[PDB]
Design a binder for this molecule. Structure first.
Ligand SMILES: CC(C)C[C@H](NC(=O)[C@@H]1CCCCN1S(=O)(=O)Cc1ccc(F)cc1)C(=O)NCc1cccnc1
Ligand code: NA
Ligand code: NA
Ligand code: NA
Ligand code: NA
Length: 162
């Protein structure tokens, strides 16, 4: 095995251990895609964004070792994204969040920057950790209802072992 293969095998191994350890947290929820989240706060909003709604958020992104690769909080002002403009783990999570929700997201590499990595700071095969707060959705949000979301999340917890 070449060095690159051995290095990426290592990256995949420790990344998978990280994902497993975070999914085993009692308040963590694992979704079928592989996305894991913990609720930091439950918002009072009643609608999740649609795939093309503009979401105002505060976030901090960290690698498995805690290194911060990007943070709107450090910039002192929120950032606005649509779900269809962001990595797959965020696209999925945002459509399951309502205004005021604050989540810790644990994103496996295949729902993040994948085999190439990104930004110079995220190497190949990196899981990512985000603390994300959904502050507002432009014009209220045209996605799932709070009740639709909660059923998905309830049912997701039920079928964890499946
Ligand atoms: C301007 C922004 C809309 C772009 C967007 N950003 C993100 O989706 C993530 C999550 C949301 C917060 C922002 N970040 S981030 O903080 O992780 C970026 C980052 C990475 C590495 C680093 F070193 C520093 C920062 C992006 O990349 N989309 C392209 C794409 C889509 C699907 C698959 N792959 C790539
Ligand atoms: Na971390
Ligand atoms: Na939610
Ligand atoms: Na990644
Ligand atoms: Na990566």
């Amino acid at each position: 095995a070449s060095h690159e293969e051995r290095m990426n095998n290592y990256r995949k191994r420790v990344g998978r251990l990280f994902m497993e350890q975070k999914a085993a947290q009692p308040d963590a929820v694992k979704l079928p895609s592989g996305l894991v989240f913990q609720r930091i706060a439950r918002g009072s909003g009643k609608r999740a964004p649609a795939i093309d709604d503009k979401c105002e958020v505060h976030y901090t992104g960290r690698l498995r070792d805690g290194t911060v690769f990007d943070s709107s909080r450090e910039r002192g002002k929120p950032t606005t994204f649509r779900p269809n403009e962001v990595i797959k783990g965020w696209t999925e999570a945002l459509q399951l969040m309502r205004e005021g929700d604050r989540w810790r997201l644990f994103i496996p590499y295949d729902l993040a920057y994948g085999v190439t990595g990104g930004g110079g700071m995220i190497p190949p095969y990196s899981p990512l950790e985000f603390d994300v707060e959904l502050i507002s959705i432009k014009d209220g949000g045209k996605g799932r209802t709070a009740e639709e979301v909660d059923e998905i999340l309830r049912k997701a917890e039920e079928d964890r072992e499946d």
